[PDB]
Design a protein around this ligand. Structure first.
Ligand SMILES: Cn1c(=O)c2[nH]cnc2n(C)c1=O
Ligand SMILES: Cn1c(=O)c2[nH]cnc2n(C)c1=O
Lengths: 233, 233
């Protein structure tokens, strides 16, 4: 069966990838974000949703998970969804300034603020994508993210979390945290994923060189044909 | 029906993408190379090939098409193929030095030279990927590419060309050029694709913002579900 990583194991795999294999940051981020988008479309495809086009709020954090979120949003657009992004804290680097402009001229909107009540979120959006915190998260959940997460736990619409349900401890989880319905584990799942009890768990990030998989004994399952995601069960 | 571009139209679409939309070079190159790999796997999937794992020679040029080739090779590896790269002329930039190392630690080999007879190519490789020249090609086909193309036209195994059959005039074609069996048109097809008479023509590069498609009246067909390629016929 497939292996679930420690924060330490995953920080290590990630640094091989950029330092040894010399994969570039935005290369992998593109592929990670595509997988997210691809998991969401397979779990909640347009035909099955009530709105044509189905609506989605993508909430992006201040670090790389936020980045994956921006990329996901843009592929969601192309896959037939009507996404909206809340990106309250934006790092000033070209990486992120470029992902912002791309989404803008796709006509994907950026909310100036978070709807403060879960019911309004539920009414506006058929799905919320949690791209706030990922693998390297150590916090200390500070504002404005505490109250975002507090709105999220009152939602009736599904939450799709990228890599790690934000607010959960990367290894241990959080019983009183948000309880997503879809989780996209990128590269390899993290021990906190054994606490996941939603209906959909996909593996994404089809870019792990087989010698890395053999080295860290990841026992990655075989993605089918040309797919960039695989449903874990 | 879908539109076929002039060199001038495509140089323009490409420069919007990087200058206006601020898509990054390696972002799109990743997605282009993934589509190539995905077209090849759907046209010539492992189960249908005689070797397990099916073998492939990817021939990379000195410019961006070569880049797409390197990316294709690496996804081909993950998709279940045993690729080999001939990259005789290598630009010294991180972009390309990184794509080279990635392939190396995937255990994808780089030929020191081209097999000089088509029969040897046919015996070693079940498929040849032509990533030599693409859209911005103006040449003046110089060495060592003249003799590569001259080996290629004597092949019995299929050739898969990325974007433009190398040696063909980007608009007009070339009746006495190489005659690929698969063509992957990236972003949008080029007028030379109306001269293509092989069995497989896929469109790839699922990243065109709809307002660009509407502006340059590309009439892009609808890629199905989450696929990054579409078969044209
Ligand atoms: C292990 N690992 C991850 O868990 C992850 N999540 C997002 N990018 C990631 N990368 C690049 C990674 O190597
Ligand atoms: C139009 N066009 C192309 O035809 C192409 N081929 C490879 N990259 C490409 N890009 C980025 C592009 O914009």
């Amino acid at each position: 069966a497939v292996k679930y990583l420690s924060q330490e194991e995953a920080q290590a795999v990630d640094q091989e990838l950029f330092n040894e294999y010399q994969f570039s940051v935005d290369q992998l981020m593109e592929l990670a974000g595509l997988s997210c988008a691809t998991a969401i479309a397979k779990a909640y495809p347009p035909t099955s949703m009530s709105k044509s086009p189905p609506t989605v709020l993508v909430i992006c954090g201040p670090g790389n998970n936020g980045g994956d979120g921006l990329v996901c949003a843009r592929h969601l657009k192309l896959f037939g969804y009507q996404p909206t992004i809340y990106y309250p804290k934006r790092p000033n680097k070209p990486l992120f300034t470029g992902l912002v402009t791309q989404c803008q001229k796709m006509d994907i909107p950026f909310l100036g603020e978070m709807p403060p009540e879960p019911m309004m979120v539920d009414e506006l959006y058929e799905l919320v994508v949690d791209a706030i915190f990922g693998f390297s998260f150590k916090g200390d959940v500070r504002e404005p993210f505490h109250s975002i997460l507090s709105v999220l736990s009152g939602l009736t619409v599904p939450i799709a979390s990228i890599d790690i349900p934000s607010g959960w401890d990367v290894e241990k989880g959080n019983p009183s945290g948000i309880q997503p319905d879809l989780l996209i584990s990128l590269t390899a799942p993290k021990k906190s994923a054994t606490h996941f009890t939603g209906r959909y768990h996909y593996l994404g990030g089809r870019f792990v060189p087989p010698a890395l998989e053999k080295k860290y004994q990841l026992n990655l399952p075989s993605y089918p044909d040309t797919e960039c995601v695989y449903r874990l069960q």
